[model samples]
Target chain A: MKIVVITEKPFAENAVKGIREILEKAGHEVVMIEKYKKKEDVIERIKDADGVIVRSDKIDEEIIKAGEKVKIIVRAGAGYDNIDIEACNQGKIVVMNTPGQNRNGVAELCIGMMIFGFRKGFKEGKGRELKDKTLGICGCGYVGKRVKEIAEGIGMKIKVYDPFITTENQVKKIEELFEECQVISLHLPLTKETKGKIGYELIKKLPYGGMICNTARKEIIDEEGLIRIMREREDLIYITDVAPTSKVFNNEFKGRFFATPIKIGAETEESNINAGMAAASQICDFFTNGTVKFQVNKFLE
Target chain B: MKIVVITEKPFAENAVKGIREILEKAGHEVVMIEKYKKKEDVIERIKDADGVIVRSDKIDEEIIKAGEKVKIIVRAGAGYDNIDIEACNQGKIVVMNTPGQNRNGVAELCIGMMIFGFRKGFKEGKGRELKDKTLGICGCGYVGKRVKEIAEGIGMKIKVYDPFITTENQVKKIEELFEECQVISLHLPLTKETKGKIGYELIKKLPYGGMICNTARKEIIDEEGLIRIMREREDLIYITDVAPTSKVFNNEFKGRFFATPIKIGAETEESNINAGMAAASQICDFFTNGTVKFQVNKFLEH
Candidate 1:
């Protein structure tokens, strides 16, 4: 079988070498295309491949149609929004994402952002400490759970608010979380119900000297509402690894607010290798044993 | 007995109120002389006092002589350097300081300084995170222990270096700490050994992306050496709650460095009240039962 990997931008040379080693070790020929300049460039490269792996690179109807021999496309990290699921369903192709591969990376970044905010981005003013501050985690999944573990190690009292988690041991209600927690970290996936979930009403409920850290999807936050709330409360601090939609929010909330220029949650060397290897293994598993355990194209059934 | 509490600036009114309640309940009269304009003002006011409680207020030989009735004087918080101890000894007056009352306040400020440095003072850049960063703590006493607790809570690995601390269960050597830690927080008292301790030689050994947070006395840090190291290493960041001796360091390292206009540890409402009440209680204890549990003068065998 022939495997072609597609990444949004150019990846480290060692990451490509690692992927090639794995695919070739499994008795499959591997072709790598990084930083595909155009849609035609991706179509041209993946036209003869049996499997495709990507990170942030879009795999829409055009690329799926162009790939005559493509059977599966795996996103190298969590969040498979870049891939058009409808296109994959129509083409009878398997689409999946490597979950929990970048859990530590994202969790580590969340703590980093919290510290940064607590210190008021290291400005001149006297900033408060995070020692006795309460941490409220919105999602209790892979990344969220890892974040909780790290928060516990740092002595922060953790309160989790996850609606999906029916059997709760220590998780609390969102209202209680907002009222008590000094730091709120959002890790919810962007769905209709979760989209814009952190709006004016929820944000306004936070206590004084509050900080919100978002390492999840950008669409989950309401940028307009956030800007309005930020305007009223000078003590409120917003930090996101995911860039917001409005440039005006970027300009106005420059100092008090912080958003990475690009998504850096999975930018670490360890995460890059883990995500790439996981994507390759998932593809290999799907073809050999008919295992779609991590597959996201279940709607076809 | 009548007591006069003198402070450089006004203490929290609640703290004074709490002290008055404690003292009056014990059947003693307490008078507060907050924010005295001059040494003459202190002399005139303390003439008829049996005890004096002070915070950063100069209690000199003249004031002690004027307060001929004063039997004891207590410094409201740690560091009784503001009170003239030699004068108090000559006048046969007992001198004391309330220690460890402001430990949490200073510790919280240390953590806050670390956060500010890690974020590059909110400058527009790819600011790094603090989780997984190794933190080196110098002088692991009251404030140092509190800083360690908070630093650990943020998932930061800790390496402590204190000559006073005998055990090294989880603490690493200074060399190992300098090499491993991305952040170093200082909490040492200013003594012959500790003064100018964190100079070029010690700071140069730190790893890349290093930050130094000082909540301890400013005399302990070699400001000239720190500024030089920061100039040489672009990744180095320094912040403090106490102001440095030199203005050049402050001017050049403005954004990369931070200093409160005045000492800000114990500026919190909680710390102010706690330290003040502790001082008042200690004075009362001394007058009634001669209990000097927190007396700094005891170390000198005075």
Candidate 2:
């Protein structure tokens, strides 16, 4: 059996090393395609793949059609927006995603930008400390919850708006959370209930000089609201680990509002190894016995 | 009684407001000479001072001689490297510094740059965690010791090399501290014993991938030793308040090394008020009963 792993940029080199470990242990050959410049390269190479793992690379209908033997395609980290689950479902292919492996990596980038921006990009004499400041975590997912825990560990007061979590600390309605917190960290997964939920009305109510840090899926935020509030509030600072599909706002608000050119929430070597090995394990299990526990496109009946 | 405060930059408006609260009720006049364009202005102003508070303003022997009525000169924050304590001792003038006020601000910056760089300058797809990483603090002053407490709270392991403090935490000799901890934070004052202490021979011993953060004086670090180690190890990150006397190695090792244009250790508004109010309390105590609790220039016979 052959399992193929294709990543946009190479998953940390150690991750490929780990994937081989999981695959080789089960008597499978591993075909690694990394940093491919052309889409045709994947289309040709993926023709005989029994299982495929990818980061945020586009696994479109054409790419899926090329994987004639692919029983499973696993997006190695969180955010399945790039995976085309609808296309996978039409082909009767199980689309899966590995979440939570990137929680610490994403949460770390959240605080890094907070202190980085809060201190005027670490400019001497121009920045303030995170001490006594209120951080409102907007979801209960791995990234949000981990950020709140880490933030509190460093002396920040944490409040959360997630009605889903019965938390021990401050848990209030979304409206109340916005009213109190100086910093708002977003961690909404792109699920039915959360998609476009943080719209203009909710964003407009935030306190002046509001800071929003997003390391999760971008579609979870209503794009219009993010733009409107960003334009009106020169006092506001917004930073994201993923670049938007349209980067106009990022270009316009250079210093105060920014985005990374790529999604790097799980960019750390540890997360790369963790998520890669998890993806390999899932692929190995699916081929060995129809294990679809992490499948996103279909249910096991 | 008249108390004078001559600061290099103007003290915060509110800091002066708090200073007056302590001196005013005692029927003492509070005079401020701030942001002077020239050094002679402070010399002209301090001639009649009974108590003085300064922020890194140099008080020369001539100034001490001019201060015929002076009793005490308090540096509003820690690290009184600017005020000549010997000159103050010769003039029988008590020199003091308010500590602990700037601890929170300085400690926060230490972690900020540490994480900032650890995250590889916030570049996408870079940075590691501080969780469970060891932080070795080299001084027990408010800044150094405070880094230990805060770094520990943030899940970093804490170690120290302070001979001045017998802490319950990981306290070891200078030789053992570098060998043990991954991150070294510096905060010792520019005392004769501490000056040039982090020399080449001693610094070369730190384990590879060791990081050094300094918020105190640059003089405490021996330049030749620092440049040698940084050249040898690409893994080292050195961040500091004061730029080197020249841009020698900093430019040579730009990303992994940095020096802020100026000192911002105690520049927060909260620290400004805290240190200012503490200075006023010391000043008020000195004149009221000749009390000298924080006097650094001399020791009363025990």
Candidate 3:
């Protein structure tokens, strides 16, 4: 079997070693197009490959509907928005993501973001601990659960709110959680229902020292509503994986507002390795036993 | 008993609440000189008191020998260097410190400092996780132990070195721990043995990509050695409570080194409250049941 790893995000030195170890041990020939700059380069490299693992690497119909030999394509992380599923289905390719592999990476990013906001230094009422406040975990998905552990590690009182997962008494409705919690971390997907859920009214209800950390996606938050509240209330702190509109928030609320220069919450060596290994194993299982367990769509005939 | 609180360190709002609650409940008259700006104010306020609690407040032989009524004096937190113990001893006044009361404050500060140094920013060769490294903890006292748990919260593997505490297979000598671990947190007090301990010889031996966090004291580190090695190894990172000697490192090595503007290890309101309440209790105990367990110096009368 020929396997190609097409990743735009550079794999960690150890992660690449782990991926090579997994493929070579299975007697499969591995191809690396890790530095493909153009469409022609990707087409030239994966022409003969039977399976390819892609990460935030842009794959259009041309690459997704590659040669007839390509049987499997795996996204080495939770979010599969990077891959074109329709193209994979038409090409009779089994596609799946290495679920929860980005958990620790995204979790740590959230905690790091919180500390970054909290420790603005002691002058001008700047520094404080998360240990004193009640934190509301808005979603209990893989990243959200890990955030709970990490945030709780620093002495935060955690209250989770998720309808999909059964946390029993631990889970509160979103409204109550917002009212009581001084801080909230959003980890919801961009669905019709969940999208644009965090608006002005809900944010206004948070405690005096209110803060919100959004690492999931910019689509889920009403960025305008957040900006309005952030501008109106000097106490409202917003930290995210998004770059806000550069009009006034950057200069006006310098201490309270921060976003990664770009969206990079899952850029950890451990997460990279975990996802790479999962993708490699999934491909190996597909070839050895015809398994399509994590296939995102129907395996086209 | 007339108990006076002569704390020069501004009592945290919450700390005053706790200290007052304890003092008023014990049927003891609590005279607070927590707002004294001059020595004359403290001397006058504490003259009629049976017990006095202080923090960083200047107290001398005159304040110690006041009215012959003072029975006890407690330094709200661990370090009692701010107050004179010999003066208290000559006047037969009890001196105690609320040991480990600032544990949470100093521990959180260390973690905060480590994060500030590590998270350089969002670009390439920027922030990294604590999960990747093994942290060497030198001097496992109250602050040291707090740092261990706080660092563990973010997923760093903790390695401790202290003669006073025992954790089987967990402890190592300072030399070995420095060589093996990627990060080291110093929590030793300023003493003859520990002072000038983290010298060039020890810091130079640390592995590549290694970092050191010192929230303990500037006296513990051989600054010249640390500064020289830090300049030599571009990979080495150093964050501390003490401000470094200016031009060479700060001008040349911008990214790898950082320090807080002030030496504020116990700067939190929570820590202030905890220490104040502990001091209040110690003062009450001395007047009520003659408790002097936390006393730094034995009262000559006792």
Evaluated with DockQ, which candidate comes out highest?
A: 2
TM-score of 2: 0.77
Model 3 agreement with the true structure over A1-301: per-residue lDDT tens digits: 9998897666777777888888889899888777668788788788898998988888788876555688888888777787788888788888888888878777877776776566554223435567768999988889888888877788899998877788755554688888989899988887887887887888989987688888887777777887788778888888888766555667788878877777667766567788888998888888888887777878537
The DockQ figures for the candidates are 0.20, 0.43, 0.35
Model 2 C-alpha lDDT per residue in residues A78-189, reported as the tens digit of each score: 6688987877877788988887887887887788778766665656544556777889998877888788777887789988877677767756568787788888888866
For candidate 1, the per-residue lDDT at B89 reads 74
**Candidate 1 per-residue C-alpha lDDT over A46-162 given as tens digits, one digit per residue, 9 for 90 to 100:** 888899989988778888888877888898877788889988888888888888887877787777677656655545444555556799999999989988887776667888889
User: Which sequence of candidate numbers ranks them by lDDT, best first?
Assistant: 2, 1, 3
Give the candidate number with the greatest lDDT. 2
* Candidate 1 positional error at B132, Å: 4.1
Rank ordering of all candidates by TM-score, starting from the highest: 3, 2, 1
Instruction: Tell me the tens digit of each residue's lDDT in model 3 across B1-302.
Output: 88888876578777787888888888788878766678888777777888877887767778777637787788887778877788777777778989887777677777766765665544334455677589999888888887888788878898889866786555656898898898899887778988888988898888877889888777888878877888788888888777665556677777787777777666665667788999998777777788878877875454
Which one wins by TM-score: 1 or 2? 2
Estimated TM-score per prediction?
Answer: 0.74, 0.77, 0.89
Name the runs in model 3 displaced over 4 angstroms: A8-10, A37-39, A64-66, A78-82, A121-127, A218-236, B7-10, B34-43, B65-67, B121-127, B163-167, B170-172, B199-201, B204-208
